[PDB]
Amino acid sequence: ELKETPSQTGGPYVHIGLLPKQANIEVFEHNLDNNLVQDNTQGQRIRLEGQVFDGLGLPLRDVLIEIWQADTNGVYPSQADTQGKQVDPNFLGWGRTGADFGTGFWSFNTIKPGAVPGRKGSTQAPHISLIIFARGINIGLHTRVYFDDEAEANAKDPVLNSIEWATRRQTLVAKREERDGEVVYRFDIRIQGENETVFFDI
Amino acid sequence: ELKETPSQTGGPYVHIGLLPKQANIEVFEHNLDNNLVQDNTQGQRIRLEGQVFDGLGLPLRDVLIEIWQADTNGVYPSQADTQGKQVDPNFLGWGRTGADFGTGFWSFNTIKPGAVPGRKGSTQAPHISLIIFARGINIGLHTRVYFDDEAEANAKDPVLNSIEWATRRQTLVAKREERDGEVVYRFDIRIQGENETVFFDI
Amino acid sequence: ELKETPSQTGGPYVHIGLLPKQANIEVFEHNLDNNLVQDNTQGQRIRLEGQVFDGLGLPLRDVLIEIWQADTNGVYPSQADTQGKQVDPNFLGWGRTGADFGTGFWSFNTIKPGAVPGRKGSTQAPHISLIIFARGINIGLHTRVYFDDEAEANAKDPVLNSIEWATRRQTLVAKREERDGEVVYRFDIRIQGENETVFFDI
Amino acid sequence: ELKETPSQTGGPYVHIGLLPKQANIEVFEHNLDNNLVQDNTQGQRIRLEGQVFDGLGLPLRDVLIEIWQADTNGVYPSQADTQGKQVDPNFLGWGRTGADFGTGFWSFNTIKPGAVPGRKGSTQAPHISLIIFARGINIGLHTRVYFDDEAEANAKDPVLNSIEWATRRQTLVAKREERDGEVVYRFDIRIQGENETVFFDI
Amino acid sequence: IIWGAYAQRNTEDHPPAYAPGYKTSVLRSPKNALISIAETLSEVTAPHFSADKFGPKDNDLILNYAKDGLPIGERVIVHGYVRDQFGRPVKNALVEVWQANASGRYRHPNDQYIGAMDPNFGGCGRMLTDDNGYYVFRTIKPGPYPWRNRINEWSPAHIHFSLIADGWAQRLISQFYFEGDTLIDSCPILKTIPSEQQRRALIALEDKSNFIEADSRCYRFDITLRGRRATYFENDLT
Amino acid sequence: IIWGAYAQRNTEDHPPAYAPGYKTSVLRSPKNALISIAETLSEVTAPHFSADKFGPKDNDLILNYAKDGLPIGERVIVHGYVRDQFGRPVKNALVEVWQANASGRYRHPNDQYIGAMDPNFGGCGRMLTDDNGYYVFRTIKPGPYPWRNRINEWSPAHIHFSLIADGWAQRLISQFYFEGDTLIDSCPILKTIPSEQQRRALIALEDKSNFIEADSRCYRFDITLRGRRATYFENDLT
Amino acid sequence: IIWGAYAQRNTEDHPPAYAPGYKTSVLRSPKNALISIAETLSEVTAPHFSADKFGPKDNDLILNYAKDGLPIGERVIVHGYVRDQFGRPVKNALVEVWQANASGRYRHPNDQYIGAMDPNFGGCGRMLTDDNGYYVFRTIKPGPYPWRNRINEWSPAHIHFSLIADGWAQRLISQFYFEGDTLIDSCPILKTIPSEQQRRALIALEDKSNFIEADSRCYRFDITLRGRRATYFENDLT
Amino acid sequence: IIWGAYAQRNTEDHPPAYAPGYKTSVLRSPKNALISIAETLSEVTAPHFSADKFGPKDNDLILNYAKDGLPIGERVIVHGYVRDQFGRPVKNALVEVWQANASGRYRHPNDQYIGAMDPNFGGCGRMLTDDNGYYVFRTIKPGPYPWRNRINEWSPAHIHFSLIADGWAQRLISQFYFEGDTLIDSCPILKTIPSEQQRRALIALEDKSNFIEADSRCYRFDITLRGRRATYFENDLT
Ligand SMILES: O=[N+]([O-])c1ccc(O)c(O)c1
Numbered sequence A, B, C, D: 001e002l003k004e005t006p007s008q009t010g011g012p013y014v015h016i017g018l019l020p021k022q023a024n025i026e027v028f029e030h031n032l033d034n035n036l037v038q039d040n041t042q043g044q045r046i047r048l049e050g051q052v053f054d055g056l057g058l059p060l061r062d063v064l065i066e067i068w069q070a071d072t073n074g075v076y077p078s079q080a081d082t083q084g085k086q087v088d089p090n091f092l093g094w095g096r097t098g099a100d101f102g103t104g105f106w107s108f109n110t111i112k113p114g115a116v117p118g119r120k121g122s123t124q125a126p127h128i129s130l131i132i133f134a135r136g137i138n139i140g141l142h143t144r145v146y147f148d149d150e151a152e153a154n155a156k157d158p159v160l161n162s163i164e165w166a167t168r169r170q171t172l173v174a175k176r177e178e179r180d181g182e183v184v185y186r187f188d189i190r191i192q193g194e195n196e197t198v199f200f201d202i
Numbered sequence E, F, G, H: 001i002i003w004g005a006y007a008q009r010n011t012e013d014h015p016p017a018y019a020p021g022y023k024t025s026v027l028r029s030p031k032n033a034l035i036s037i038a039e040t041l042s043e044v045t046a047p048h049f050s051a052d053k054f055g056p057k058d059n060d061l062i063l064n065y066a067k068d069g070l071p072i073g074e075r076v077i078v079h080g081y082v083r084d085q086f087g088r089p090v091k092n093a094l095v096e097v098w099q100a101n102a103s104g105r106y107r108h109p110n111d112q113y114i115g116a117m118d119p120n121f122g123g124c125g126r127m128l129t130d131d132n133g134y135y136v137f138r139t140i141k142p143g144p145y146p147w148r149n150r151i152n153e154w155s156p157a158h159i160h161f162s163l164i165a166d167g168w169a170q171r172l173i174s175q176f177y178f179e180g181d182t183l184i185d186s187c188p189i190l191k192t193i194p195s196e197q198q199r200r201a202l203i204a205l206e207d208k209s210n211f212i213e214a215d216s217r218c219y220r221f222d223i224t225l226r227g228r229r230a231t232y233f234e235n236d237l238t
C-alpha cells in the first residue's frame, strides 16, 4: 500500500494556477469560474456570497473557494453517482472563485440543490460542499452550506445531527435574503475564535 | 525505583465500572453512591450541586465526580489522619456521582466539614477535595470547594493564598443558598476559557 | 518464485467445514457428499468401502476421505483432461465422506472407472485416486485403489510397476465381493505397521 | 519464573545412592526399602511383583522402582491430602526396590489401597502410582497399577477412561494370584514393543 | 516511621491534558497550567472500604451477571500486584474494572455499536488487594472497540481500571491492554502517553505457567502508584 | 501453451509425517517413505464446482447460521489471493473454511470444552475464487482452543481452510493465524513446520486500510499452491 | 465491483493545521478539532472535465505564454503517475500547476520580489491524466523564492499542483521539489509535514534516461491520492 | 491459599526419551507418546521423611564411610537452594546423592574400571532441605568416568542426585557437573538435553567466598522443581 501525498498550503499566489484571470494572466481560452448556471440549467437560481475571517476577525483577501453540489433533483453530475437517475445535462456541479483582493468578498452563481440520499436509507437536507484554500492553511478546509429556509429538512439531516455540540450546527446554515428579486444566501466563514465554523474531515 | 502507572481517560462508559446503576447494571448488592450522610452522622447537612462546562460553555453530560472530606470536627475517617482525635464513626468521608445524561447536573448529600490543620501549625479553611473524570480528560482533575460563608477562614487559607493570581481564587468558592430550609452550595466547574476553575497538581 | 503454503493437519473437527451434516450443522442447501452416481450416469455401479487403521490396529473414527476418478470411458470430468474425448456429462468424478464415529466404516457409491492413458503411450489399469485427512496426519496421504478383477491390466500398470518392493503392490488392490447383486470393493487402509498401505508423493 | 531442572538418567549405579544395601554399602542405620507394612498397619496385605522388559523382550536387571499409594481407606499419608480424614498412622505410603541383578525380578510388600476421590466429585478405582528409573531412561517413567479384581471400579475410573485406545487400558491391570494364602499381584512392565505399558506425563 | 508527603507526580510520565490527536481533549483540557501545592492531611488521607460489603462474585465477570448460561468469549484470569513507587505493597486498595464484551460492545445506554450484546455478561467487577498488594479477577477477553475520533478509529482490546488506595494523591484511573494486540501501535488514546516505556507499562503479559488446562488463559499485570517518603527530621505535614 | 507436470512438492517446506511433539501423529504416520511418482492425467486433473449451487450467505459466517440475532464476537473480514508457485492466479478454486466460535468452542459433537456455544454461530463457509484468484469471507474472530496434547496445550486463534483447485496434486488443507497472537510461538502443531519462514506464511496480516468504520476489522491472507511447468519440447504426460 | 467509501485520511501523514513555525497558520487554523463524518454520495462524487476544452499548449509552460521569443531558464520535462493508495491508476484527473519563473519571480499582482519578470513566461498549465494515470508537462525550472516568515526565509525551487479526481474526498493541493536542492532541509512549510518519509514523497527525481539531448532534462514525480474500498457485504453508502 | 495442580512439565526443557546418541535409550524408550492426565490427589501428594531417622554423618561423604583414615581426593562442600518454578522454597525435601570416588571409580558390584577403589570412601549421602530450601553436604570431588557408549566415551566429573519433595509430580533424578570441566561439551548424556540454557542449569559454580582456608573448596548449585498454582475460583482437584 501507498501513503497519500502530503498536503501543503496553496500559498498567496494560488490564483496563478487556479484563477489566472484574477492574476491577470490570459493563457487559456476556456477558464474555470464561479458560474455554475448555463442557459438551459434547471432549478432556482441563487447567489451564494460571504467573506472568510481569520482569528483577528479580519477577512482573508487571498482565499480561494470551490463548491461541489447536486442538481435541482439531488443527482450529482458524476459517474460515481449511483442513483440511476438522469442528471441535468447542462450542469457541471462545481465552480471556483477567489475573494476580491481589496474587500475579501467572494460569490458564486448557482442553483439550489435538491435533497441527496444519505446513508442507510436516510435523506440529507439540501447542501453545498465547500472547500477553502489559502496561504496559512496547510490542508484545504471542508465545510457544508445548508439553507435557513429548509428548517424541517435540516432538523433531520444526518451530518448536522452528528455534530454533538448543537450550538455549532448553526454555523453551517446560510441566511436567505432577497436583493431585487434575486435570491441570495450569505455564508460567512470564521476560521478561528468565537462562532468558529464547523470543518469536516471527509 | 518504579514509575507510576500512566493515567488514561476514563472514557464515556466509566459508569459501567464506577456507577453501574447509572448504566442500568444491577450486579452488586452494595453500590457506592453520592450520599455521605448516615442516620447518626454528625454535623450540618448540606447539598453540593452544579454542572461542569467545556470550552464552548456546554455542560459535560458524561462526567463522573468524587469528593473526599473530613467530618464535622475536621478529622478524616482515614488511618493516615494523625490528629489523634476520634473521627465521627458513621462517616465514610467519600462519595461518587455522575452528571445526569440529559442535563449535566450533579449533586452530593453530605455535611459541612470542620477546619483541618494545614502545614507548620496553620489551619486550613473548611473545604471539600473534588476530582473529575470523563471522556476527553486524560488525567483526573483535582480542585477544592470552599464555602462563601467562611470568608474569614478563606482569607487566611494557606492553599488559596498560594494561588498568585488572586482573581482566580474566587473560582473555588461555592455559593450558599437556602432551598426550602435545605442548605445548598452551588459549585459550577469551568474546564476551560473565561473564569476557568483552578485545578491542582496534588 | 513462491513457496507452497505449508500443510497442517485437518484436526478432529474437519467435519464442520467439509461434511457439516456429519457435525449436525445444516447451513448449506447443497452439500458435497459420497454419492458420485447421478440418475443418468453411465457405467457399472459399485460400492467402495473399508476402514483406516492406526499403528495399534485400531480404526480411525475421525478420518475424512476423498476420491477422484475418471468416467466409465477413462475420461476425467476436468478441463485439464487432454484426450479430446467427450466425458460423461452426468459425472462429477469426485466425492467426500467421513468414517462413522462409532465404527470407523466409510463408503462411496460410484462407478468403476475406465482405463486412462499413462505417460509416453502407456495405458494405466483402472484406478481411483484417494486422499485421507485426519487429526494426527500433517499432510493429506495420497494412495490409489486398483481392482482385483483387473489382474491383467494391473500387471502392466506403470505406477504399480514402479513400486520396487513387489510385495507392497498388493496393498493397493481392493477385493471384489457381491452383496445381494451389488458389487462391493473392500479397501482397508493401514497407515503404519505390517501390511502398511503404499502412500504416494504425487 | 524459573525452568525446572532437567532430568538425566539415573545410570546403572543408581543403587549406590538410593539402595546402598544392594550395592553392598553399609553406611546408614536406617535404610529405605520395599516394605510398606508395619506391625500395626491396617488393611489387606498383598505382594506386588513383576519384571520390566526392554524392546528385545529382555528384563532390565538394573532398574529401580518406587511406588506411592494411599492407605486402606484411600487417604494419603501427606500434608497435601485435603480429605479431612485421619490417615493410618503406621503407614508411610511409599517404598523403593531394585530388580535382582540376576533375574530382573522386583517386589514390594504393601497393602491394597482404598479408593481415592477423583476430580470434580468422581471416585478413582484403587491404584498404586509407580515410577521406574534406570540406565537408558532419561526421565523417570510414570505408570499406575490397577487390580483385576476391581473390575467394576476400573470400568468407571476417570484416568483409565481417558486413554482413548481402549486396548491399551489392559496393560495397567495387575493379575491377582494366591500363593500359599498370600495374595500376589503380578504386574510386568513392557517399555517398548507389543503390549507396551501405558506411561503418563503427570 | 513517620510518613511525610507523597513524592511529586512526574508529569513527563503521563499524558498532557491537551492532546489534539485525541479530539475530545481539545475542549476538555484546562488552558491554565495546574497549580502545584505542598501536601496536607487532605491529600495524604483516603477512605477505607470493607470487604464485608462485597459479594462473592464481585471479582468474577464470568459469573456475576450470568442468568441463563455462561457469557460467550475467551475465558481469562488477570492477576498482579499493586505497589507504590518505592516498591512497597499497597494493601486493601479498592480496584474497580469495566470493559466491553467479546464483541467489543459495552453494556451502556450510549453505546450503539452493532457488535452483539451478550445477555449473560455485564462487564464490571471490583476487589480489594490483599496484604501483599495482590489482586485477581476472572473475565471474558474484550473485543477491540471502533469509535469516532477519526471515522475509522479502533481501540485495542482493553480493560479499564480505577484505584482508591491510601492517599487521595494516589487516585488513579487508566486501562491495560493484552500482549501482542496489533492495534496498540495505532491507538490515539495510548499515544497521548509521551514515552515508549510508559506505553509499555500498560500491557498485560501472557502468563503461560498460570493457565488452567481446558479452562482459562491468564495475564499478569502490575500497577504502580505514587509512594510516600519517610521523615526523619522536621515533620511539617502538620 | 502445452502444460506439463506440476513442480515437485518441496518436502522441506512442509511438516514431516512423524512429529513426536504432536502426539497423535506417532501412530498415524507411515513408517515407510512416500513413493514418488511421475505425474499422469490422474494427478493433473481435478473436479469443477459451479457457483450456481452456492447459497448467498455461504461466505458469510456472521449471518449464515444466524437465527434470533447476531453471533457474539469480533466482526472481521478475511480476504486475499490464491496463486500458484509461479505467481499465476488460481481461478475458480473451491475454498472451504471452519473454525471455533468467539469462546474457542467448536460446533462439533466431540468438542466438550466449557467455552460457551453461540446459538447464532455455525463456524463453516465456502466460496470460489474469482478470475484474479481473489477470495473474501466475513466471520467472527475465533478464540484460542485448549486441547489435550500435553495437558495444558492451547492453540492460537485460527481458521482452518481447504482448497480444491485445478490439479489433484494441488490438494491442500492448512490453517492460518492472526498477526500478533502470542500463542503462535508455543503451538506444537505449528511447530511441526521446519522453517521459520514457512511458519510465518500461515499468519494473516492486519489490513488497516480495509477496516470498515464502526463495523468490521480486516485481515489479508494469501495462499500459494503448486504450479504447473509449460512444455516446449516432448510432452510425455500422455 | 460495488465501491464503498474512501479509506480514512491518515492525519499523521499530513501537516497539522496549527504549525507555529509557519507563522501565517497561527491565525488561519481552527481551534476546534475537525469533525469526522461517515461518507455519503456527496463525498464520493466529483466533477468531470473534458479534454475538448483544453488548448494544445495548456501543458507547455515553455510556449503557452511565449510572445516574442522563448522564456529564459532551464528547459525541463516533468512526468509521472497519479495512483490511489491501493495502487490503481487515477484516470482523467485534472492536474493544475503554477510556479515562479527562472528568477524565483511569480507573475502575480502581489509579488514584489526584485527577481526579474520574464515577458515570455506565465507560469501556469493544466492537463488531464490518461488511462494509465500518466501525466507530462514541460516548463522552465523555477528559482527558489525569498519571502517573509522569518525575514530571511527562502523556499526551495518548487512547482505547486492541484488535483481534482474521482471523489471530492480526494481533493488535494501540494507542491513538489527537485532532487538535491539544499534549501529543502530548511523550509518551514515543508517542515510542517511530521515525518521524514512523507517529506521525501514531495521530491521529484532526476530521470536521466528520459533527458532529450541538446534540449531538456527530465524529472519523475508520482502522486498518490486516497483510494476507495470495495464492498462485498452490506452497502450502506445509500 | 487453596492449591490447585502443578504446572505442566515443559517437555522441551528435558531430554526426549528416545535419544540415539545415548545408545542404551534405543531399547529402553517407549515408542508411544506419554499420555498426559489432569492431576488428582495421587499426583499432588508425596511421602514425608523425618530427620530423626538420619545419622549425623549422612551428609558427610568424607567421613561417613571412613574406617582407617580419610578418603583420598579434593575436599569440597556443595550447597544451594531447592525452589519451585514460582521461586518458593521447597522445605524438608529428601535429597539423595551418589558419585564415584577421586579415581572415577564407583563402589558398585558392576563397575570394573581400573581406577582405584578407596577403602575410606563410600560415595552416598542424603539430607533434608531446611525451611529456606537450603541444603549442604561435603564430599571428595569425583573423577570423570570412562564407559562404553562409543568405546572411548568419558563423562565429566559429576554427582548424581534425586529429590522427593511435596508432590509426586515433582519426583526428579538428575546430576550436576563442576564449572569449567572440558568434558561437559562432549558428553552424550548431557547432550540429550535440547537446549543450551538447560544444559547450563546442571553446572555447579565455584563459590570462592565460601572456601574454607587450608581445608575445602565450595560449589554453589541450585535446583528448581515444578510448582503448584493457587486456585481462586473453582477447585476441581476434588
Ligand atoms: O468513544 N467511545 O465511546 C470509547 C472509545 C474508547 C473506549 O475505550 C471506550 O470505552 C469508549
Ligand SMILES: O=[N+]([O-])c1ccc(O)c(O)c1
Residues within 6 Å of the ligand: C011, C012, C013, F145, F147, F148, F155
Ligand atoms: O484436539 N483438538 O480437538 C483440536 C486441537 C486443535 C485444533 O485446532 C482443533 O480444531 C481441535
Ligand SMILES: O=[N+]([O-])c1ccc(O)c(O)c1
Residues within 6 Å of the ligand: A011, A012, A013, G145, G147, G148, G155
Ligand atoms: O509568501 N509568499 O509569497 C510565498 C511563499 C512561498 C511560496 O512558495 C509562494 O508561492 C509564495
Ligand SMILES: O=[N+]([O-])c1ccc(O)c(O)c1
Residues within 6 Å of the ligand: D011, D012, D013, H145, H147, H148, H155
Ligand atoms: O555406563 N556406566 O556405567 C555409567 C556411565 C556414566 C555414569 O555417570 C555412570 O554413573 C555410569
Ligand SMILES: [Fe+3]
Residues within 6 Å of the ligand: B011, E145, E158, E160
Ligand atoms: Fe473502553
Ligand SMILES: [Fe+3]
Residues within 6 Å of the ligand: C011, F145, F158, F160
Ligand atoms: Fe482448530
Ligand SMILES: [Fe+3]
Residues within 6 Å of the ligand: A011, G145, G158, G160
Ligand atoms: Fe510557491
Ligand SMILES: [Fe+3]
Residues within 6 Å of the ligand: D011, H145, H158, H160
Ligand atoms: Fe555417574
